[PDB]
């Protein structure tokens, strides 16, 4: 029944031959610069782990540092800071280059090694009998981002990770500031990388990418900014600029800031979560907002290459670019299903429907 | 009937899967539920003890002089090991055929470990490392031993496909019209019905066990399940392989029930009269079938070990030896536990 259509109905479903294989439950929102909740999916405020969605949220305790402007950092280390990465030579190597600029070594670090994100790299890992180390974690900027905020404010490089340190006492503030949250409303847990890691309603996931958009607008229309507005224009840049140290080749963040050239940002969360921020726009205007946009999304059991899927879906119902520029993500949009003999056996449908019908159909976040 | 498998990041919900299970008698009658016991499911490689059926139905295919280890590997999803290439190589000789017979094709090893020796070493997967390759060589077996040509054994219009369709609308007790077919990973057709009759496919396998065992008279479908439950639970190895869960499930259960996996995350068990069955409700056997709605297999093991739990099934020194995949570990790359796993549902009865 179209009228009695419900968030608890949102999916993606994959099919072989038209029989139901998995669903998959969505949840998605779409922001406004102010955090004002313009589209949804699912639960738009359901309680999320960020993970590594968050980490420009971390870029900005980092560079909000006082003392970290004078090691230099560039914008290629900021982007870096901002990354799940995939662990190539030249991460590793603005790693090591990052460690040298605030005179601290591999040993440092209190993240540690695993496989690769990149199929590709973890080929040649596995070709060498190459054992991944600290430095070729995928948060191993955040994590030298973090050295240099301990060693810029004499708070000692022990301990950097935990959350009585001080740089983490600041990442917690900056978190729920973004968030516009009291504290008691973003709980943490512990991350893969060993850092303190918030979970807090997913709409104001999409609030801080919201933020990081608008403060890029600002900025480039020479609008006067805070400290923090300009800080946040400065991440959003770094990461448009530098969109392979974010992520790398063939990664869906690399490829889709590529293909957007400068209109967007967007971060991965482990467990399926995605983040993007997006400047104003003919696109925006015609959605109904004078300003910047965050989106969103969670899918609940986790899956990764639904979550890309999906994403790219909700970029084309959002008419987010032009069908040219999301050409570039199709592989991603619409996976292959073919079997070992090169036969297609089935595919990926999105029966959700985004929600901005009769007054009596409620629409309980589910 | 909103049944969950929940993970938590220092009790935080990190994910959540939806479990559809159903618990059945011999005769197929539902005794415990998750979620949809009638879910319409792909049974993908669960199906296979069925085909496995079809193909030893075959007239002729005794002739060959297949064994249990080899009839084990016309039941699996291996990982691809050395001895399960060396078994489709040894099987395809006794039907006087040829790797090039075969119309399954090499995909990376169902196997962490085993992927990454292939990776080291260059090696691409061929069709005989199919996880599937010990069905095929039964497929051509049947259709070489009928006469009907090698040449599109694994096409629907074959009558091997033909006798495969039959036998799991049999097995399952439905009308033709109520099994669905798409076509599987290994380029075969593959069949959909509701999730309960796959617990009933497990529980006959499992109840012929027990005829057999008794020296009751069986027809012969009825002693050719008993020789397919006997070759699984004897050859789990073949089944699946080192480390994996239908493997290990077997071998702690040594002869107590057969366990199968199907892609996508399903499953299924057939378990034969025990204390525990009795303690049930039943005086047969009884058969599990369980999907993850979104796929997700580390999910399914530590859903299924949890239900052995609930029902009684082994004794806890016996589930003990599942312990990794009941509660799967969640740990940092610092050697930290950072979550778990929990099982919020309630069986219904
Ligand atoms: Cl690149
Ligand atoms: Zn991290
Ligand atoms: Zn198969």
């Known amino acids: 029944d179209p009228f009695t259509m419900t968030p608890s109905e949102d999916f993606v479903v994959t099919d072989r031959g038209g029989i139901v294989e998995n669903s998959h439950r969505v949840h998605a929102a779409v922001v406004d610069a102010k955090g004002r909740l313009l589209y949804a999916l699912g639960n738009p405020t359901r309680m999320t782990l960020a993970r590594s969605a968050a980490k420009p949220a971390q870029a900005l305790a980092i560079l909000e540092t006082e003392g970290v402007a004078g090691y230099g950092f560039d914008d290629a280390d900021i982007a870096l800071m901002c990354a799940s990465h995939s662990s190539e030579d030249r991460h590793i190597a603005r790693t090591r280059a990052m460690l040298s600029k605030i005179k601290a070594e591999e040993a440092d670090l209190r993240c540690g090694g695993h496989p690769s994100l990149s199929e590709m790299v973890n080929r040649s890992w596995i070709k060498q009998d190459f054992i991944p180390t600290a430095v070729c974690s995928?948060?191993?900027?955040?994590?030298?981002?973090?050295?240099?905020?301990?060693?810029?404010?004499?708070?000692?490089?022990?301990?950097?990770?935990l959350p009585?340190?001080?740089?983490?006492?600041?990442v917690k503030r900056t978190v729920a500031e973004l968030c516009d949250l009291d504290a008691g409303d973003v709980e943490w847990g512990t991350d893969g990388c060993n850092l303190p890691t918030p979970a807090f309603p997913l709409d104001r996931l999409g609030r801080?990418?919201?933020?990081?958009?608008?403060?890029?607008?600002?900025?480039?229309?020479?609008?006067?900014?805070?400290?923090?507005?300009?800080?946040?224009?400065?991440?959003?840049?770094?990461?448009?600029?530098?969109?392979?140290?974010?992520?790398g080749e063939g990664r869906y963040c690399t490829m889709l800031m590529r293909a957007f050239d400068g209109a967007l940002v967007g971060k991965l969360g482990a467990d399926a979560?995605?983040?993007?921020?997006?400047?104003?726009?003919?696109?925006?205007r015609q959605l109904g907002t004078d300003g910047a946009?965050?989106?969103?999304?969670?899918?609940?059991?986790?899956?990764?290459?639904?979550?890309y899927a999906v994403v790219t879906e909700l970029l084309e119902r959002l008419g987010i670019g032009s069908?040219?520029?999301?050409?570039?993500?199709?592989s991603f949009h619409h996976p292959?299903?073919?079997?070992t003999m090169?036969?297609?056996?089935g595919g990926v449908s999105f029966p959700f429907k985004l929600r901005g019908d009769d007054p009596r159909l409620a629409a309980v976040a589910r």
């Open 342 to 345: 090169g036969v297609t056996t």
């Open 323 to 330: 069908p040219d520029v999301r050409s570039q993500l199709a």
């Open 273 to 284: 979560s995605y983040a993007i921020g997006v400047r104003a726009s003919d696109a925006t």
């Open 208 to 247: 801080i990418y919201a933020k990081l958009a608008s403060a890029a607008d600002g900025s480039d229309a020479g609008e006067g900014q805070s400290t923090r507005c300009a800080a946040l224009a400065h991440i959003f840049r770094a990461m448009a600029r530098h969109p392979e140290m974010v992520a």
């Open 138 to 161: 995928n948060c191993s900027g955040k994590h030298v981002g973090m050295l240099a905020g301990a060693r810029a404010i004499g708070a000692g490089t022990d301990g950097y990770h």
């Open 293 to 307: 946009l965050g989106i969103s999304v969670k899918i609940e059991d986790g899956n990764l290459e639904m979550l």
């Open 336 to 339: 292959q299903r073919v079997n």
């Open 164 to 170: 009585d340190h001080p740089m983490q006492g600041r």
